[PDB]
Amino acid sequence: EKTAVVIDLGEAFTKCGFAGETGPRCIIPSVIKKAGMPKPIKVVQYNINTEELYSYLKEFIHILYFRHLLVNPRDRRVVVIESVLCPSHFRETLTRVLFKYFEVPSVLLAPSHLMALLTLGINSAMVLDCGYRESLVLPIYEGIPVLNCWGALPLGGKALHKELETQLLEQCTVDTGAAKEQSLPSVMGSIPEGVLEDIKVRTCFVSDLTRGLKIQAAKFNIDGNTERPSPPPNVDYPLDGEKILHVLGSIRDSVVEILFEQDNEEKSVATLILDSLMQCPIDTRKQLAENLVIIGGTSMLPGFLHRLLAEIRYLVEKPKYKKTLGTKTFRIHTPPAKANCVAWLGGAIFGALQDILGSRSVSKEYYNQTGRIPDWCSL
């Protein structure tokens, strides 16, 4: 047998490499540069025609299997990591591309949350997945994902990128280099997603709960006269060479707060753990609480894990969660690989198990016969 390849198709970035390795070999933006198109189209797009999606995935998988990885597709197996409740037609297409065009031996559709649990070694743990599109949580108890007690909110990368763009356009101060030393607002109508992502990573950080709670009430201005903490210094960011955008200190520590803002509904990234944990079985409560896992690149943002764990323990004392989750000890697990590449590492650890892989995985001979991929929906 040969070392099975692991792929993990995401909206922002795709993880690729081989099984039984310390981390992924290639990690790249999930896009393709088609002739005529100035900006490259995104390879994973939900709610489009199958033929157009088929062509994009055919183009992308080709780049992964030749330019990034150097190996024959037909020779060795595949371990496709994809999140639970991934759209039906997308997963059906992705398999149909691998089985028909590339003619792979067998694909294994592992849920990202159960794979993240294997990397630690613990059999039972709560898993939060703060991705690009949606920040999803799914309790895993001793190998069994509990779909009953699922939770998701659109407070990921996309929702954060959009919030940054909005704030920058309000307090817009750019030095074009054409008598634009004076503050010039909205010279460009929209900012490209590639720039916004680079600003987010380098400039913006996650504030402490004490400082963050003041920032929330400050921008609200709820019958108070200038009750904001002192912001960090303003950082100057180059746009397309000559144009120098002066990023305000307030924007850096306020953009993140949309994730941890209550917004009346009581629906934050913090609340989603406690909302799910309260809905879980009464016996499983204390085991899941003690074993928390925080995967996804959105949680890589500096000082996110401290704010989350703090915001949890504050929301615990709130009267809604005070009865059930009152006297619970919330402890976070530190996975071996980085927060972005926890999902991938599980699939590699699973891919190294050649004996179990072949049995669980769906063979091409079965797919060609039936034409029915197994899912958590009815058969």
Partner 1 sequence: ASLLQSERVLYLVQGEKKVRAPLSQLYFCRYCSELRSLECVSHEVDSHYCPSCLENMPSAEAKLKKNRCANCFDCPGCMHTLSTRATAYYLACGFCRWTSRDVGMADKSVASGGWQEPDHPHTQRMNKLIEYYQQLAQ
Partner 2 sequence: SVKIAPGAVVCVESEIRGDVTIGPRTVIHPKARIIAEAGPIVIGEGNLIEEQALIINAHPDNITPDAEDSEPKPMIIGTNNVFEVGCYSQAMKMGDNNVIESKAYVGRNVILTSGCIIGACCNLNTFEVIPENTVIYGADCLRRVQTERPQPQTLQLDFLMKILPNY
Ligand X SMILES: Nc1ncnc2c1ncn2[C@@H]1O[C@H](COP(=O)(O)OP(=O)(O)O)[C@@H](O)[C@H]1O
Binding residues among 49-108 for partner 1 as defined by CB under 8 A: 58, 62, 65-66, 69-74, 103
The entry of ligand X, partner 2, partner 1, none that residue 340 binds, CB within 5 to 8 Å by partner kind: ligand X
Nearer to ligand X, 137 or 289 (CB): 137
CA distance 96 to 4: 19
**Tokens standing for residue 334:** 């530190």
Q: Tell the smallest beta-carbon distance from residue 52 to partner 1 (Å).
A: 14
Write out the E strands in the chain: 5-8, 13-18, 26-29, 31-32, 41-42, 78-82, 106-107, 110-111, 126-130, 135-137, 140-141, 144-145, 151-153, 174-175, 235-239, 243-247, 292-295, 362-363
The total of other beta-carbon atoms located within 10 Å of residue 71's CB is: 12
| Other CB atoms within 10 A of residue 145 CB | 18
Q: Which of residues 259-318 bind ligand X (CB under 6 A)?
A: 296-298, 300-301
154-191 burial, b for 16+ CB within 10 Å, e for fewer? ebbbbbbbebbbebbeeebbbbeeeeeeeeeeeeeeeb
Q: Is residue 132 close enough to count as binding ligand X by CB under 6 A? A: yes
> Choosing among partner 1, partner 2, ligand X, none, which partner's interface includes residue 177 (Cβ < 5 to 8 Å by kind)?
partner 2
For residue 221, how many other CB atoms are within 10 A of its CB? 11
| 253 binding partner (options ligand X, partner 1, partner 2, none; Cβ < 5 to 8 Å by kind) | none
Return the residue of 193, 197, 208, 290 that touches ligand X, per CB under 6 A. 197
Binder of ligand X out of 4, 5, 6, 12 (CB under 6 A): 12
- Binding stretches for ligand X (CB under 6 A): 10-13, 131-132, 157, 197, 201, 296-298, 300-301, 340
Positions in the binding site for partner 1 (CB under 8 A): 3, 20, 22-23, 25, 35, 58, 62, 65-66, 69-74, 103, 118-119, 121, 336-337, 349-350, 352-353, 355-356
